[PDB]
Design a protein around this ligand. Structure first.
Ligand SMILES: Nc1ncnc2c1ncn2[C@@H]1O[C@H](COP(=O)(O)OP(=O)(O)O)[C@@H](O)[C@H]1O
Ligand SMILES: [Mg+2]
Length: 384
């Protein structure tokens, strides 16, 4: 699709690597460095080929033009060396072959967020080659993610954006069939565009949570005070029909666990969808349902899963989402998961390293599966 850092010669060149070093911080110190640990090899391969390395990154959300130490990449710069912070980097920097410097937070610059042309051209001035190695940022057009690549002598993607693209697109443009997609969450309305793209691709599709509750109500079931989006019932109904004529299996919950208050404390009751009374709510799938899911995972050649299928955070309402998680683990399909809350689940059940690929990207992960990304567009345009 586009050019890669592996296929380009970096000997003695000025190389500008955009990374996601946007780490959490507490009163001046780093609390989680997984992003640095992930970004390291890209920086090691550049140095090993004796590039003159300029490391580019964002941190928090500062006021453009207003320097504050709170959003300084200083602690990162110390933590990188252990594995200099350059401040006035736009006017130029000498960098010897084989060493690496970290430019100060790119979001300080007047014009980053608008993808200002002038700013971008100036960034492109400062380097021979630009390496977009920041998939978690690729879904927005900003001078440091999009503009710079538009006007840089030579532009390409780094190996991380490569791993992430390989995994996502592996399971979306020639999946080992059957492909199954599990999609859960609070709202149809935040995941409808994802459902649309996957519909043209999957063999089975499974909705969970709010989403499933909306679909069950579009079908005419009663679900009491369960979370649902009434305003998307027509959308859900029409999507159900589209699935039917494409022959995409779309099994809804046949049994659920309900309670009349959401807490570790109240009566959890396993029920047929028939039997949901007027002031109960659905918080999880039942055994019959999560056995149907368990079958499709076991038979799957590929799996894509975004969103827990019950209120897994409370313990009575977690059996459904664990069951599912375990099925994807034991399963032999190439599994791909993503989402803030889904990772949280995979962490709670300590099943994270059993999925073939875990995305930590959040929004860019989601927009890609929707079939929509500015960073990627330009990297190919330049490969051409
Ligand atoms: N039936 C339900 N009722 C209330 N909340 C739910 C229900 N199903 C799922 N949820 C909640 O929605 C969140 C998952 O939403 P979503 O953002 O789509 O997942 P992710 O962030 O993993 O992609 C979870 O935190 C979960 O507690
Ligand atoms: Mg659950």
């Amino acid at each position: 699709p586009f050019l890669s850092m592996s296929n380009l010669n970096l000997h003695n060149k000025r190389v500008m690597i955009r990374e996601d070093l946007n780490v959490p911080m507490k009163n001046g110190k780093i609390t989680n460095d997984e992003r640095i640990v992930r970004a390291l090899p890209t920086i090691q391969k550049a140095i090993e080929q004796k590039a003159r390395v300029m490391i580019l990154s964002h941190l928090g959300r500062p006021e453009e033009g207003k320097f504050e130490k709170e959003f300084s990449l200083a602690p990162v710069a110390r933590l990188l060396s252990k594995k200099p912070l350059i401040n006035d980097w736009l006017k130029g920097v000498a960098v010897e072959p084989g060493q690496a410097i970290l430019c100060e937070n790119v979001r300080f610059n007047k014009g980053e967020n608008e993808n200002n042309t002038e700013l971008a051209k100036r960034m492109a001035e400062l380097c021979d080659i630009f390496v977009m190695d920041a998939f978690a940022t690729a879904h927005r057009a900003q001078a440091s993610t999009a503009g710079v690549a538009a006007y840089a002598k030579l532009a390409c993607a780094g190996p991380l954006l490569i791993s992430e693209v390989e995994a996502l697109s592996r399971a979306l443009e020639n999946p080992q069939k059957p492909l199954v997609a599990v999609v859960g969450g609070s709202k149809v309305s935040t995941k409808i565009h994802l459902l649309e793209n996957l519909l043209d691709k999957v063999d089975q599709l499974i909705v969970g949570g709010g989403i499933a509750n909306t679909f069950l109500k579009a079908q005419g079931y009663s679900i009491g005070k369960s979370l649902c989006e009434n305003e998307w019932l027509d959308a859900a109904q029409q999507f159900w029909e589209k699935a039917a004529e494409k022959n995409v299996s779309l099994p809804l919950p046949v049994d659920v666990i309900v309670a009349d208050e959401l807490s570790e404390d109240a009566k959890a009751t396993v029920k047929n969808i028939d039997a949901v009374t007027s002031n109960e709510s659905i918080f999880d799938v039942g055994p019959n349902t999560s056995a149907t899911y368990a079958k499709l995972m076991a038979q799957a050649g590929t799996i894509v899963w975004n969103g827990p299928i019950g209120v897994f955070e409370i313990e009575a309402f977690s059996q459904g989402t664990r069951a599912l998680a375990q099925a994807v683990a034991k399963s032999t399909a190439y599994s791909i998961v993503g989402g803030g809350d889904t990772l949280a689940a995979l962490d709670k059940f300590n099943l994270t390293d059993q999925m073939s690929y875990v995305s930590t990207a959040g929004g860019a992960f989601l927009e890609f599966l929707e079939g929509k990304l500015p960073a990627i567009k330009i990297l190919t345009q330049r490969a051409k």
